[PDB]
Design a protein around this ligand. Structure first.
Ligand code: MG
Length: 377
């Protein structure tokens, strides 16, 4: 009955829970419990057991030491319709009954802000569900099994962890982190792996384009060819810096073909205007084409080569999915098609210069903070 149904979040606060200035927090599935059957997922609402015999006594000690006991569980099956919320609620209370200590439980029912590794659930714990008492991150701890451990991190553990979301949730918040085996059983630290792209490296500063000695626009007409992955932030950059400066905007998600596109470039160049071709432009054929309009009109031609890697683009796309309900998702399939076809632009196709456009932070402090969070386990 201590349940709160919020948007894309469920919170249970057991009788006996008090706010505290430090937290011991756990994932649920694969950390505090596992299936009795051995299946990844429970055959029934009754298909669970406490993961290790040592857990209840550990939790009792933590509580005596003044730790608020908390669960951060990803349960996207509820948002996906696979698992009824009331069934889960019943399961959580029975678990808690068995664990024998007061817990507060936060449940990420959906994709996005609250789904580990993104720190939505921590921020809710802190801002909304700890009665205003500041939590010391350094004195707290997060324990979870989605820890990005390598295959054979232990005997029988022949496959790497399905996910790194638990470790990364801790990394996003700054929480000391352990796996269930390291924490409850005092096993040695297992080897693990983090995603290649680390959003904490994303900088807001830095030059806008390269070389820093050249100049973004020119006073005279010219054709600018944009190159970059889908979701790389091309269109946003172009509106901000070119269209607002007087360049004609040519775009292929809007038009619908490359004929529609080239004739706009020729047109606009007759109209004494400046054109920018805002599409992927993965390969030599695509770009030579717009290079030909430039040479037709006796105008220079440049390339804006967006440096965004595939993981930076994917990251950008998740950030937009999370913060903008109108943003159309840019699917991976579409990412791989570009990559499969990509070949770098070279001065030898006929560019006066190629500009490199670095990937940087696109804006409110809370959204910056969100942007440099790991967002995929
Ligand atoms: Mg887990």
């Amino acid at each position: 009955l201590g349940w709160e149904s919020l948007k894309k979040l469920l919170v249970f606060t057991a009788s006996g829970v008090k706010p505290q200035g430090k937290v011991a927090a756990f994932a649920l599935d694969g950390t505090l419990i596992t299936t009795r059957s051995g299946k990844v997922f429970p055959t029934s609402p009754s298909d669970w057991r406490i993961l290790y015999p040592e857990i209840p006594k550990k939790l009792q000690e933590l509580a005596a030491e003044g730790y608020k006991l908390v669960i951060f569980t990803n349960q996207m099956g509820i948002g996906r319709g696979k698992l009824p919320a009331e069934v889960f609620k019943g399961k959580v209370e029975a678990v808690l009954e068995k664990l024998g200590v007061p817990f507060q439980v936060l449940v990420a029912t959906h994709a996005g802000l609250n789904r580990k590794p993104v720190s939505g659930m921590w921020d809710h714990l802190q801002e909304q569900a700890n009665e205003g008492i500041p939590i010391s991150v350094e004195d707290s701890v997060f324990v979870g099994d989605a820890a990005g451990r390598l295959a054979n991190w232990a005997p029988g553990r022949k496959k790497k962890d399905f996910s790194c979301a638990d470790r990364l949730f801790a990394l996003n918040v700054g929480l000391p982190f352990a796996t269930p085996e390291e924490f409850f059983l005092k096993w040695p630290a297992a080897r693990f792996e983090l995603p290649a792209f680390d959003p904490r490296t994303i900088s807001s500063a830095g030059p806008l384009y390269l070389p820093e000695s050249s100049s973004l626009l020119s006073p005279n007409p010219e054709v600018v060819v944009a190159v970059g992955f889908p979701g790389a932030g091309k269109s946003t950059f172009i509106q901000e810096h070119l269209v607002s400066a007087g360049y004609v905007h040519v775009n292929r998600d809007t038009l619908g073909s490359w004929q529609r596109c080239v004739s706009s470039c020729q047109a606009a160049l007759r109209q004494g205007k400046r054109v920018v071709i805002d599409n992927t432009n993965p390969d030599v054929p695509s770009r030579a084409r717009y290079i030909q309009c430039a040479k037709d009109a006796g105008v220079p031609c440049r390339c804006f080569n967006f440096c965004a890697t595939i993981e930076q683009a994917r990251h950008n796309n998740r950030f937009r999915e999370m913060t903008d309900p109108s943003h159309a998702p840019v699917s991976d399939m579409v990412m791989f098609s570009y990559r499969k076809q990509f070949e770098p632009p070279t001065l030898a196709e006929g560019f006066l210069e190629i500009l490199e456009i670095p990937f940087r932070l696109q804006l409110d402090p809370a959204l910056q903070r969100l942007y440099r969070q790991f967002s995929e386990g």
